[PDB]
């Protein structure tokens with residue numbers, strides 16, 4: 001098996017195993033509404049086996065960056081519908097990544113309110129993009145009932161994604177955002193049904209997953225994880241146990257895939273997760289053509305997601321097939337505004 005062999009995820013046939021990783025780019029219109037610029041960008045990348053969209057918030061309290069899109073209202077659904085129609089006409093496939101940033105936010109995005117979280121534990125560091133430099137606030141610990149409200153927002157978010165014509169949704173369970181905050185022991189000190197045991201810590205992620213399953217069918221839902229717990233001040237007392245529990249439970253549900261941001265190293269627990277899950281496993285982080293093909297050949301992966309290389313290379317699959325040069329990425333325009341560093345990376349000549 002190579003990157004260029006087709007794969008099915010659930011009942012969706014992909015033409016290859018080169019996946020576009022989810023990538024926040026902050027190019028949405030005011031009101032967090034997807035636009036024609038975003039449609040153009042995704043269409044340029046439609047040769048990807050599957051596109052995983054930029055993280056998209058399921059409620060106004062789940063945002064923490066400027067100009068990132070939402071999926072909670074009709075205006076946003078309409079904007080996304082133009083994206084998915086254009087991707088589909090271009091012969092591509094796309095899933096919406098459902099987001100809630102939890103404590104990784106700033107009151108300036110939340111009309112002065114505090115970011116919410118499983119527990120009132122301040123994340124270290126500075127808020128990305130915010131100027132002048134600012135620490136994160138200490139978040140407000142959610143009430144038990146408010147967590148059910150969040151589940152309902154993911155449910156409505158998944159329904160809205162379906163109305164917007166996506167091929168499926170991916171739950172953002174990774175990178176220290178809300179669901180990950182609940183999942184891990186350092187950030188979750190709750191003593192209700194949502195903390196204080198592994199079953200309880202994983203509960204919110206599985207409840208959101210089940211809601212998405214009611215709307216889509218499990219074979220059109222994926223989940224994103226970050227098993228090294230290395231972004232946004234995370235940490236868990238037994239991550240081998242925590243992430244394989246999740247993998248096992250998601251596998252029981254027959255979900256379409258798990259995608260893990262976890263570069264290859266001796267301590268990679270990807271193989272334990274893959275085995276416990278039993279379905280298609282998408283690896284990610286610092287892979288290139290050679291190491292991706294090696295992972296497919298060894299059975300460590302069923303497909304491989306590329307992030308920065310897809311930012312810089314709209315026709316990454318053709319470039320990889322041809323062992324062609326790759327455009328150099330410009331991290332200074334990963335975020336920010338407009339078409340420069342967004343839709344102006346050239347295709348192969």
Ligand SMILES: Cc1cc2nc3c(=O)[nH]c(=O)nc-3n(C[C@H](O)[C@H](O)[C@H](O)COP(=O)(O)O)c2cc1C
Pocket residue numbers: 021022023024025053054055097172174175224261284285286287305306307308309334335
């Ligand atoms: C600019 C940028 C935006 C990203 N946005 C998201 C995101 O919205 N959701 C997510 O799960 N990961 C996001 N990531 C992480 C990537 O999906 C991926 O895990 C990471 O870039 C490593 O893979 P790579 O080495 O192939 O780039 C982002 C990464 C970058 C550089």
Ligand SMILES: Cc1c([N+](=O)[O-])cc([N+](=O)[O-])cc1[N+](=O)[O-]
Pocket residue numbers: 024055175230231232261
């Ligand atoms: C490394 C990283 C993030 N971070 O700030 O540490 C955030 C991401 N995100 O989803 O916004 C993704 C990241 N990543 O996967 O490289």
